[PDB]
Design a protein around this ligand. Structure first.
Ligand SMILES: Nc1ncnc2c1ncn2[C@@H]1O[C@H](COP(=O)(O)OP(=O)(O)OP(=O)(O)O)[C@@H](O)[C@H]1O
Ligand SMILES: Nc1ncnc2c1ncn2[C@@H]1O[C@H](COP(=O)(O)OP(=O)(O)OP(=O)(O)O)[C@@H](O)[C@H]1O
Ligand SMILES: Nc1ncnc2c1ncn2[C@@H]1O[C@H](COP(=O)(O)OP(=O)(O)OP(=O)(O)O)[C@@H](O)[C@H]1O
Ligand SMILES: [Mg+2]
Ligand SMILES: [Mg+2]
Ligand SMILES: [Mg+2]
Lengths: 50, 372, 76, 262, 361, 173, 328
C-alpha cells in the first residue's frame, strides 16, 4: 500500500524490465517463443508506459 | 649488445658478495676512485702487510667494473676478488658446510671490510665520505656537572635500534644515538647516569642507515628475527638528527635544491628534443661551509636511495641476498638484481620492500646525497 | 678503561677492560653479561671492524667511546 | 608438449581445493580464506609469475601443504549476466530509416572515434564522450542504441533503470559502481542505460527505498561516469524523457557532449 | 605444556566422594556392591568452543573453589581433563580500550573553562579519592557525568587531559564501535566492557559521541533501529546495581543533548549534567595565549585587543586564528609573527564567508 | 525454552524480565534480518505462556519503560493478567521517600522537608536520592559533614534544574 | 597476552594456548595481531600483519594519475592556498618549524561542478607524490547497519600506519551530511557512519601526517562537526572563472588543439556569460566536430561561433543556470 503510491504497482516495475528486453527478441537465437502473458484487474491502474 | 647492466653469476652462492658490490659501485665517488688509482704511482707501504692486499682489492674491484661496462661479457667475473678477500680476511676462507661452500658472509661485514681497505689506500679524505661526524654532548643527568664534547665519535652507518616498538624510520634511528650510559663518575658519587646524545654535526656525503631486524633470544638462547614491518617513504630528510647550529646551514642549501628541482620537471622535456642543480649547490657550498669542497660534508638533507640490500632469511639461518640498485643513467629507473636475473623495477617497487614476514627485508639503506 | 657497548636490545653496558687487552677479551666479557657467543659479535667503532689480537690501543679507543654491537648473518 | 605437462602435474593436484585470495604479501606468500572455513598462510610454487594475481582471484591450493598451484583467470556473477549480452540484433541501421540528421549526432560521437581516431588526431584534443537521448516516447530512442551496437561490434552492455532501483539499500551503490568497472575492464564498451527517467517514478517501500536510495545511486554514478576512476572506454548512451529529475553534475557538459533532442 | 583447548564450564554437579561400600554416586544405579565399578567421584561438565559438551571426571588438583559454573578453564585437547584455570576471556577491541597512559595536557593547556574543570573533578575524581568521606557522609557517589554543549569547546580534549592528570584508569570507547552488524558479538563488547572494568576498578569509562547508541527512539517502525538499540539496552542493565559497578564510572561526550533517550534523563546513569558554554571575554583571551605559546611571536602583542575584536568565537575558531596568522607571516616572509597577522586571520577564516550579498538588508 | 524448564523443578519461580524492549518489537521484517530474529524468539514465548504447557507456580514479572512499543500479543491477558502501573511519586509520596533517605545520611536534624519538596516536583524516586547526593556536594562545598536545610534548599533547586534539560512524555492505557 | 603464554582464537573458531618458537620475538606480539601457528601443534612460527577484515580498502588505494600539475586551469590564487596547507609541509616542515605553528592539515573543496573540483586534486596528486586514498561517500553504505562502521574505522588506522599519506574524501554529501532526528526514519542507520567519520578525525590521538580533503558539491547541508573550523582548517571556495580566467583556461585548451593562428581567446570568453571551463573544454571538441564536418585539418573562427551558441542554448534548457541553493 506504499508500492501503489510508489510505482503504481511494484509488480509493474518488474513488468517494465521484461518488456523492454522483449523489444529486440526478434532474433538473437531466431525469434520468440517465450511469451509475456500479463494480467491485472484493469489497465487504468497499469502504468501508461506499459 | 645490451641496454642495461649485465648480471653477476653465482660461484657456489656468492650472493652476499655480489649484493654489496653492485651497490658500492653506485656510490658516486667510489666508482671514480678505484679506476683513477694505479699501482706504483706514488703510494707505497712501510706498515702492515695487509695494506698490500688492500691495494689488490682496489684493483680487483676496478677490473670487475671494467668487465661490467663491457657488453661482450654477458656475465661479469668476480673470481679475481674472491681470493684476495679470503687472504685478507680468513673469516671468508672458512667452511659454512662442505661441498664447495665457503663461509657465507654478512653484507654488513663486507661493507665495513671493503671500506677499511679503501680508506687506507686513499687515506683520510676518502674515509670521511662514508663517515658521520657528531657533535656529542655528554651531560650529567640531574643538573650537569660537566660537558664532554666528542668529535671522535663516528660510525659509517647509523644504528636504527628496534625493540618492536620502533616501526618508523625516524624513531630508532634517533633513539640509538640518544642513550643513557652508566659511567664511573666522581661527579654525583662513584657511578652516575650521564645522558649521552649524539646530534649530527657534519652530514656524510653518502648515508647508510643500518636496520636491525636481527635479535638474540635470551630465552631459548638462539638468534631470531624481528618480524615487524617498518614503513618508510623513498625519501629521507635529516633535520631531526641535526645539531641545532648545523641544522640552519644545511636547510638553506636544501631549500635551493628543491627550487631547481621544480624547474627541472618542466625543462627536462625541452632539452631532450646535472650541472643545473650542482652549480647551485656548489655556490651555496662555499657560503655555508669552508671553501670549494670537503670530504664528509654534504649540505643536502634530501637523500635518494642508491641501493637496498634485501635479505631473505631468519634466525642465523643461511639465506639469500638480493640487491636493488639505482640507475644513474635513467632517473627514477631501478634495476632489480636477483644475481643473474636483472629486471626493470620502478622506484615504487623499492618501497614495497619495507615489508617482511619471512623475506624481502631491507637490511641496509644506501643513500647518495641529492646535491652531490 | 671503562668502555661501553650499545646493544641492539636497547641498553648500554659497562665493561672493565684494559686498552692493552684485545678485542677478544671485550667479546668474552659481553658473553658474561648478555649470553651472545663471542663470535657472532661484530663490534664497530669509526666504521671499522675490530679484530682479535688488535688491542684497544691499535684502534686507539679511549673511554667515553660507544662501540655498537651488531650480529652477522649468513647467505647462500 | 609432453615435458611441459610433466612436472606441471607433479606439483598440481589431485584435489584443487578452491580458495579465495584476500590479499598478497611480497615475500612469496599470501593469506587465503577458503569458503569451507579455515584460513591458511599459503606458499606459492612461483612458476606462475609472482605478480599476476590480485585480490578477488580464485586460486588452486594443493591437497597436501596448501601452496598456490595455479590461478584461475576468470570467474563471473549472475548479476553481471543481466549486464552482459549474447545477442546479435537482426536489425541494422536504416531499420531506423527516417530522422536521418539527428542521427549524425550519435554516429559522430559514438561510432566514429572508435572507427577513426585518426580524424580526432588532426584536431588533436580529447575525442567525444557521452550522449543523452531525449524526446517523446516511441520516437526510436530504444532502437537507436541497439543500432549503433550492431555497427561498432564492441562490448554492448544494456541495463534497465528499474533494476538500478532496488528494495534493498547498500547493494544499490555496489551495482551501479560495478557497471563501469566491468565496462572499463574490457577496453571498448558502450553502456546503454535505458530509462534513467525511471529513478524518481519507481520505488518500492519507503523505509528501504525512498529519497535515500535514489540519492546515493545518483551520487555513485557521478564518480563512475567520469569521477576520478580513469577506467576504460565507457561510451554512455542514456535514454530519458525526465531529464529534469537528473543532477546538474550529470547533465553537465563533457559527460553529454552533443545532446540529442527528438 | 601447550597446546590445550580453551573452554568454559557448564556446571559442577558433583557426585558423592569415594569412601563408600555401595556406590559413591548421587543417581541410583542398578546392582549392588560398587565403589569404582561404574561409580565416579565429583563431576564437571564443560562446554567446548569446538561445540559439544563432555562429562569428564574433574581433575583432583583443581578445586570446586577454582570452579564456578561459568568459569573459563583450560582443557587438555588430546584427552579431556581440566588442565588449569585462566582469567575470563576478553575481545580484542576490549583489550584495545585499556590505558596506554595518554599524556596529561594539564589545566595549563586549557584556556578558560574554569567552571567546567571544577564540576569535573567534583563529579568523578573526588568520589574516588574521598571515597571515605562519601561513606562518612552517608551518600552514594554519582554514577557518571554527562558532557554536552556545542562542538568547538574542547569537550573531548578536557576529558583526556584531566583523567590523565589525576590518574584513574582511562577506558577509551567510541560509541559507534558498539554499533555492529553482529548481535551477540557486537553486543558482547558491552558485556566484556564491564567485566573488564570491575577488575580494573576504580575506572572511568569515556564514551565519545552518545548518539550512535543514544537514540531517543525506542518506538521504531520498520527499520534496523531495533538492532541498534540492543546495545543501548544492555548498557542500561549494567548501569543498574547488581553490585560491582559502584567503583565503575562513566564520562560521556556528545555534540547534542536533545537526542538522548528518556532512560538517560534519569539519575543513576549520568547524575551530573555539565554544559559547555560558548566562550567568554576572559576565556577567549586565555585560549589564544595557549596556542601562541607554542609558536614564536613578537613582543608587541596584546591579547585583549584580539579578544575584544572577536566576539562569539569558539575555541576551534580561535585555534584557527593563531594558525592562520603564521600562514600570513610565511607569505610576507618573516621568521616572527606580528600582532597585525592574527587580526587578518579573523577575516580569512571564521565560520562563514561574509555577511552575504545584501540588497536591502 | 530451557529457562522455563528450570522453573518447573525449582519451587514457585518468579521470572523477572528486566527492561524488555529488545524483542518487544512488532512484526516488522521489511527492515533488516534482525527483525526476524526478534520474531523467531517471540513465537517461542507464546507457546510456553499458553498451551498444554500451562504454569501456575511459574510467574512472569515483566518490566518495561514504555509499553506501547510492544507487540499486542505481549499485551495479552491471561499471560499478563494484571497490568500494574507505578506512577511518578506524588505530592506527599516524595515526602514518604525522603524520610527513609534522611536516615542514611548524616544530618543536623531535618524534619522541615515538607513544603519545599511538594513545590519542587519533577522528581522520580531515584532523584530523591539524588537530592541527598547533591546536598552532600553543597555540604562538601561548605566543608560540612551534615546535611543541613541550608544545603537541602540549594540542592532541590539544582537537581530540578538539570532535569529540565530534556523532557519526557509518556501516555498509558 | 599473559605476562611471564598467549591465548589465540583461531579463524576456525577454536581457542588454544600457544607460546613462542625460535623465529618469534616476544616484543613483537600485540593485541589483535594475526599470527601463524602450526597446523598440527599450535605454536607461533611467524607473526603476520594485523586485521584481515579489510579487503575492499586495497581497491581504493590509487596510483597517481598523470593529469599533470600544470594541467589545472589558470594561475589563479585559490590553488596556491592549497599549496600552503597541504603540499608545502610535506616538502618542507622546516618553515613551519621555524614558525613553530601547527601546520594546517585539512581543507574543504567546494563550489559549483564543472569548475574542475576533482581536476585540481588530480593535479595535486601529481605533485606531492603522497599516497592517495580515495573514498566515495555512497560506497560507505552497506546492507546491514554497523557494517560500514567497521569500514571507516579500519580505513583510518590503516592510514595511520601509512606515512606521508593523503585521504581524499570525495562525494560525501551522503554519508557526511547533517545530523537530525526522524523518530521513525531509516536515516538513523546512515547517520551511524556519519558519526564514525567524526570520531576518527579528532580521535583521542592526532592525525600523524594525514592530510585531509573533503570534496563537497554542497555546503548547503553538512555536519557542523565535520565542518568545524579546526579540523578542516582553511576552507577554500572554488569559484567560476573570470573574464580573464576563461581566457586562461581556453588557452590551455586551444593550445592543445590545432587552430590557424591569428585568433582571439579573449573574444570567445566575452561571448560566453559567466560560465564553467568544462564548457570551454567542450567548445573546442564540438567545434572540432564541426571541423571534421567541413573536413578541415584545422579549426577556424567560424566553427567556434556555432559551438558557443550550441552549449548556451542547452544550458538554458537545463537546471543550474541559477541553482546554487542560496547561501554564500
Ligand atoms: N524514425 C524512425 N525510423 C524508422 N523506424 C522507426 C522510427 N521511429 C520508430 N520506428 C520503429 O518503431 C519502433 C518502436 O520503437 P521503440 O520501441 O524502439 O520506440 P521508443 O521511442 O524507443 O519507445 P519508448 O517511447 O517506449 O521508449 C522501432 O523498433 C522502429 O523500427
Ligand atoms: N577551552 C579551550 N582551551 C584551549 N584550547 C581549546 C579549548 N577548547 C578547544 N580547544 C582546542 O580545540 C581543539 C579541538 O577540541 P576538541 O576537538 O577536543 O573539542 P570538542 O568539544 O570535543 O569538539 P568536537 O568533538 O565537536 O570536535 C583542542 O584540541 C584544543 O586545542
Ligand atoms: N580548471 C580546469 N582547467 C582545465 N580543465 C578543467 C578544469 N576544470 C575542469 N576541467 C575539465 O573538465 C573535465 C571534468 O571536470 P571534473 O569532472 O573534474 O568536475 P568536478 O569538479 O569533479 O565536478 P563533480 O565532482 O561535481 O561532478 C576534466 O577532466 C577537465 O578536462
Ligand atoms: Mg524504450
Ligand atoms: Mg569530540
Ligand atoms: Mg569530483
Amino acid at each position: 500500500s506504499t508500492r501503489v503510491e510508489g510505482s503504481g504497482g511494484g509488480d509493474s516495475e518488474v513488468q517494465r524490465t521484461m518488456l523492454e528486453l522483449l523489444n529486440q527478441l526478434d532474433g538473437f537465437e531466431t525469434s520468440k517463443n517465450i511469451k509475456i502473458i500479463m494480467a491485472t484487474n484493469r489497465l487504468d491502474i497499469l502504468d501508461p508506459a506499459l | 649488445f645490451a641496454q642495461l647492466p649485465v648480471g653477476f653469476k653465482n660461484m657456489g652462492n656468492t650472493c652476499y658478495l655480489n649484493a654489496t658490490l653492485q651497490a658500492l659501485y653506485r656510490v658516486n665517488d667510489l666508482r671514480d676512485m678505484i679506476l683513477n688509482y694505479n699501482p706504483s704511482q706514488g703510494v707505497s707501504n712501510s706498515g702492515a702487510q695487509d695494506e698490500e692486499i688492500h691495494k689488490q682489492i682496489v684493483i680487483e674491484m676496478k677490473r670487475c667494473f671494467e668487465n661490467l661496462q663491457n657488453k661482450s661479457f654477458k656475465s661479469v667475473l668476480p673470481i679475481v676478488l674472491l681470493n684476495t678477500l679470503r687472504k685478507c680476511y680468513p673469516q671468508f676462507a672458512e667452511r659454512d658446510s662442505q661441498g664447495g661452500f665457503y663461509k657465507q658472509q654478512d653484507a654488513e661485514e663486507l661493507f665495513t671490510q671493503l671500506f677499511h681497505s679503501m680508506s687506507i689506500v686513499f687515506g683520510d679524505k676518502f674515509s670521511e665520505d662514508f663517515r658521520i661526524q657528531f657533535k656529542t654532548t655528554i651531560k650529567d643527568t640531574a643538573n650537569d656537572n660537566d660537558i664532554t664534547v666528542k668529535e671522535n665519535e663516528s660510525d659509517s652507518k647509523l644504528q636504527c635500534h628496534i625493540s618492536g616498538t620502533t616501526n618508523f624510520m625516524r624513531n630508532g634511528l634517533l633513539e640509538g644515538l640518544n642513550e643513557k650510559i652508566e659511567k664511573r663518575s666522581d661527579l654525583t658519587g662513584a657511578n652516575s647516569i650521564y645522558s649521552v646524545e649524539k646530534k649530527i654535526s657534519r652530514l656524510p656525503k653518502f648515508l647508510t642507515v643500518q636496520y636491525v631486524r636481527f635479535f638474540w633470544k635470551r630465552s631459548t638462547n638462539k638468534k631470531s628475527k624481528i618480524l615487524r614491518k617498518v614503513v618508510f617513504p623513498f625519501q629521507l630528510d635529516v633535520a631531526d638528527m641535526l645539531t641545532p647550529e648545523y641544522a640552519a646551514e644545511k636547510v638553506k642549501v636544501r631549500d635551493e635544491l628543491r627550487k631547481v628541482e621544480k624547474e627541472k620537471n618542466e625543462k627536462e622535456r625541452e632539452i631532450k628534443r646535472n650541472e643545473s642543480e650542482k652549480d647551485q649547490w656548489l655556490e651555496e657550498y662555499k657560503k655555508h661551509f669552508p671553501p670549494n669542497l670537503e670530504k664528509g660534508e654534504n649540505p643536502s638533507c634530501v637523500y635518494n636511495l642508491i641501493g637496498v640490500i634485501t635479505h631473505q632469511g631468519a634466525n642465523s639461518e643461511s639465506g639469500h641476498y638480493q640487491a636493488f640498485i639505482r640507475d644513474e643513467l635513467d632517473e627514477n629507473k631501478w634495476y632489480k638484481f636477483n644475481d643473474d636475473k636483472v629486471s626493470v623495477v620502478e622506484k615504487e617497487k623499492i618501497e614495497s620492500l619495507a615489508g617482511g614476514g619471512e623475506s624481502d627485508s631491507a637490511l641496509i639503506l644506501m643513500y647518495k646525497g641529492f646535491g652531490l | 678503561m671503562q668502555i661501553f657497548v650499545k646493544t641492539l636490545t636497547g641498553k648500554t653496558i659497562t665493561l672493565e677492560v684494559e686498552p692493552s687487552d684485545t678485542i677478544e677479551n671485550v667479546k668474552a666479557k659481553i658473553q658474561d653479561k648478555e649470553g651472545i657467543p663471542p663470535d657472532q659479535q661484530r663490534l664497530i667503532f669509526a666504521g671499522k671492524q675490530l679484530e682479535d689480537g688488535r688491542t684497544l690501543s691499535d684502534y686507539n679507543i679511549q673511554k667515553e667511546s660507544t662501540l655498537h654491537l651488531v650480529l652477522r648473518l649468513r647467505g647462500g | 608438449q609432453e615435458e611441459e605437462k610433466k612436472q606441471l602435474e607433479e606439483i598440481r593436484g589431485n584435489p584443487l581445493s578452491i580458495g579465495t585470495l584476500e590479499e598478497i604479501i611480497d615475500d612469496d606468500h599470501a593469506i587465503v580464506t577458503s569458503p569451507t572455513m579455515p584460513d591458511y598462510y599459503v606458499s606459492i610454487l612461483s612458476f606462475v609469475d609472482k605478480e599476476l594475481l590480485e585480490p578477488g582471484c580464485s586460486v588452486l591450493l594443493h591437497h597436501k601443504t596448501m601452496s598456490i598451484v595455479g590461478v584461475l583467470q576468470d570467474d563471473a556473477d549472475p548479476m553481471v549476466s543481466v549486464m552482459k549480452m549474447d545477442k546479435s540484433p537482426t536489425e541494422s541501421y536504416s531499420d531506423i530509416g527516417g530522422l536521418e540528421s539527428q542521427i549524425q549526432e550519435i554516429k559522430e560521437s559514438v561510432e566514429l572515434p572508435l572507427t577513426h581516431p585518426e580524424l580526432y588526431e588532426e584536431m588533436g584534443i580529447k575525442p567525444p564522450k557521452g550522449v543523452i537521448l531525449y524526446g517523446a516516447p516511441g520516437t526510436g530512442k530504444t532502437l537507436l542504441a541497439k543500432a549503433v551496437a550492431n555497427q561498432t561490434s564492441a562490448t554492448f552492455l544494456r541495463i534497465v533503470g528499474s533494476e538500478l532501483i532496488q528494495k534493498y539499500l547498500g547493494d544499490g551503490p555496489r551495482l551501479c559502481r560495478q557497471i563501469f568497472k566491468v565496462a572499463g575492464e574490457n577496453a571498448p564498451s558502450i553502456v546503454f542505460i535505458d530509462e534513467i527517467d525511471a529513478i524518481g517514478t519507481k520505488r518500492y517501500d519507503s523505509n528501504s527505498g525512498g529519497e535515500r536510495e535514489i540519492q546515493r545511486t545518483m551520487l555513485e554514478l557521478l564518480n563512475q561516469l567520469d569521477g576520478f576512476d580513469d577506467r576504460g572506454d565507457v561510451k554512455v548512451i542514456m535514454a530519458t524523457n525526465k531529464i529534469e529529475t537528473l543532477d546538474p553534475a550529470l547533465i553537465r557538459p563533457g559527460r553529454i557532449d552533443r545532446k540529442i533532442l527528438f | 605444556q601447550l597446546p590445550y583447548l580453551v573452554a568454559n564450564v557448564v556446571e559442577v554437579m558433583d557426585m558423592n566422594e569415594i569412601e563408600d561400600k555401595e556406590n559413591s554416586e548421587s543417581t541410583t544405579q542398578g546392582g549392588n556392591v560398587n565403589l569404582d565399578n561404574t561409580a565416579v567421584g565429583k563431576a564437571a561438565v564443560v562446554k567446548t568452543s569446538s561445540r559439544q559438551t563432555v562429562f569428564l571426571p574433574m581433575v583432583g588438583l583443581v578445586d570446586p573453589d577454582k570452579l564456578k559454573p561459568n568459569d573459563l578453564v583450560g582443557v587438555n585437547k588430546d584427552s579431556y581433563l581440566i588442565l588449569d584455570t585462566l582469567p575470563s576471556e576478553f575481545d580484542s577491541r576490549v583489550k584495545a580500550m585499556e590505558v596506554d597512559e595518554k599524556p596529561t595536557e594539564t589545566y595549563s593547556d586549557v584556556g578558560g573553562l574554569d567552571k567546567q574543570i571544577e564540576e569535573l573533578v567534583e563529579a568523578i575524581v573526588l568520589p574516588m579519592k574521598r571515597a571515605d568521606k562519601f561513606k562518612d557522609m552517608g551518600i552514594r557517589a554519582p554514577k557518571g557525568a554527562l558532557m554536552y554543549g556545542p562542538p568547538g569547546t574542547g569537550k573531548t580534549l578536557l576529558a583526556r587531559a584531566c583523567a590523565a592528570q589525576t590518574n584513574a584508569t582511562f577506558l577509551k570507547l567510541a560509541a559507534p564501535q558498539l554499533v555492529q552488524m553482529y548481535i551477540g558479538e557486537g553486543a558482547k563488547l558491552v558485556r566484556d566492557a564491564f567485566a573488564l572494568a570491575k577488575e580494573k576498578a576504580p575506572t572511568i569509562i569515556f564514551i565519545d559521541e552518545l548518539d550512535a547508541i543514544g537514540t531517543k527512539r525506542f518506538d521504531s517502525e520498520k527499520s534496523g533501529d531495533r538492532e541498534v538499540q540492543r546495545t543501548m539496552l544492555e548498557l542500561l542493565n549494567q548501569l543498574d546495581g547488581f553490585s560491582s559497578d559502584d567503583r565503575v564510572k562513566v564520562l560521556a561526550a556528545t555534540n547534542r543533548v536533545d537526542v538522548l533517550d528518556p532512560a538517560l534523563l534519569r539519575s543513576g546513569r549520568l547524575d551530573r549534567k555539565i554544559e559547555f558554554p560558548l566562550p567568554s571575554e576572559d576565556s577567549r583571551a586565555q585560549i589564544l595565549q595557549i596556542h601562541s605559546r607554542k609558536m614564536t611571536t613578537d613582543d608587541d602583542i596584546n591579547w585583549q585587543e584580539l579578544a575584544r575584536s572577536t566576539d562569539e568565537f569558539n575555541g576551534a575558531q580561535l585555534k584557527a586564528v593563531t594558525v592562520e596568522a603564521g600562514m600570513i607571516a610565511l607569505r610576507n616572509g618573516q621568521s616572527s609573527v606580528k600582532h597585525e597577522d592574527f587580526v587578518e586571520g579573523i577575516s580569512e577564516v571564521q565560520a562563514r564567508k561574509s555577511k552575504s550579498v545584501s540588497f536591502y538588508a | 525454552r530451557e529457562m522455563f524448564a528450570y522453573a518447573k523443578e525449582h519451587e514457585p519461580c518468579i521470572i523477572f524480565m528486566d527492561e524488555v524492549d529488545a524483542i518487544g518489537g512488532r512484526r516488522f521484517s521489511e527492515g533488516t534480518s534482525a527483525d526476524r530474529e526478534i520474531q523467531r524468539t517471540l513465537m517461542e514465548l507464546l507457546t510456553q505462556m499458553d498451551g498444554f504447557d500451562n504454569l501456575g507456580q511459574t510467574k512472569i514479572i515483566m518490566a518495561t519503560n514504555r509499553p506501547d512499543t510492544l507487540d499486542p500479543a505481549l499485551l495479552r491477558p491471561g499471560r499478563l493478567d494484571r497490568k500494574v502501573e507505578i506512577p511518578l511519586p506524588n505530592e506527599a509520596g516524595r515526602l514518604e521517600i525522603f524520610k527513609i533517605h534522611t536516615a542514611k545520611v548524616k544530618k543536623t536534624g531535618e524534619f522541615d522537608f515538607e513544603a519545599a519538596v511538594k513545590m519542587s516536583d519533577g522528581f522520580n524516586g531515584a532523584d530523591i536520592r539524588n537530592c541527598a547526593t547533591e546536598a552532600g556536594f553543597f555540604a562538601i562545598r561548605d566543608d560540612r559533614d551534615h546535611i543541613n536545610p541550608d544545603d537541602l534548599m540549594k540542592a532541590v533547586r539544582k537537581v530540578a534544574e538539570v532535569k529540565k534539560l530534556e523532557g519526557t512524555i509518556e501516555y498509558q492505557k | 597476552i599473559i605476562k611471564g603464554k598467549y591465548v589465540i582464537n583461531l579463524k576456525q573458531i577454536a581457542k588454544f594456548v600457544v607460546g613462542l618458537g625460535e623465529r618469534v620475538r616476544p616484543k613483537d606480539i600485540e593485541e589483535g595481531m594475526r599470527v601463524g601457528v602450526d597446523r598440527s601443534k599450535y605454536n607461533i612460527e611467524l607473526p603476520l600483519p594485523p586485521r584481515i577484515d579489510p579487503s575492499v580498502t586495497m581497491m581504493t588505494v590509487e596510483e597517481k594519475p598523470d593529469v599533470t600539475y600544470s594541467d589545472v586551469g589558470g594561475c589563479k590564487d585559490q590553488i596556491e592556498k592549497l599549496r600552503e596547507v597541504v603540499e608545502l609541509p610535506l616538502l618542507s616542515p622546516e618553515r613551519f618549524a621555524t614558525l613553530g605553528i601547527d601546520p594546517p592539515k585539512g581543507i574543504l573543496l567546494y563550489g559549483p561542478p564543472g569548475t574542475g573540483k576533482t581536476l585540481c586534486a588530480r593535479a595535486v596528486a601529481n605533485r606531492t607524490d603522497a599516497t592517495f586514498i580515495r573514498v566515495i561517500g555512497s560506497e560507505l553504505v552497506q546492507k546491514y547497519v554497523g557494517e560500514g562502521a567497521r569500514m571507516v574505522r579500519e580505513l583510518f588506522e590503516m592510514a595511520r600506519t601509512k606515512k606521508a599519506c593523503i585521504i581524499f574524501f570525495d562525494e560525501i554529501d551522503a554519508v557526511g551530511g547533517a545530523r537530525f532526528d526522524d523518530g521513525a526514519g531509516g536515516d538513523n542507520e546512515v547517520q551511524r557512519t556519519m558519526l564514525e567519520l567524526i570520531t576518527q578525525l579528532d580521535g583521542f590521538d592526532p592525525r600523524g601526517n594525514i592530510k585531509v580533503m573533503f570534496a563537497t558539491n554542497r555546503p548547503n547541508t553538512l555536519d557542523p562537526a565535520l565542518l568545524r573550523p579546526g579540523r578542516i582548517d582553511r576552507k577554500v571556495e572554488f569559484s567560476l572563472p573570470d573574464l580573464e580566467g576563461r581566457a586562461n583556461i581556453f588557452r590551455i585548451h586551444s593550445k592543445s588543439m590545432s587552430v590557424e593562428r591569428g585568433i582571439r581567446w579573449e573574444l570567445i570568453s566575452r561571448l560566453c556569460p559567466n560560465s564553467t571551463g568544462a564548457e570551454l573544454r567542450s567548445v573546442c571538441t564540438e567545434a572540432g566536430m564541426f571541423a571534421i564536418r567541413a573536413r578541415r585539418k584545422v579549426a577556424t573562427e567560424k566553427d567556434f561561433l556555432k559551438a558557443v551558441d550550441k552549449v548556451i542554448s542547452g544550458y538554458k534548457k537545463f537546471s543550474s543556470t541559477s541553482r546554487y541553493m542560496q547561501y554564500n
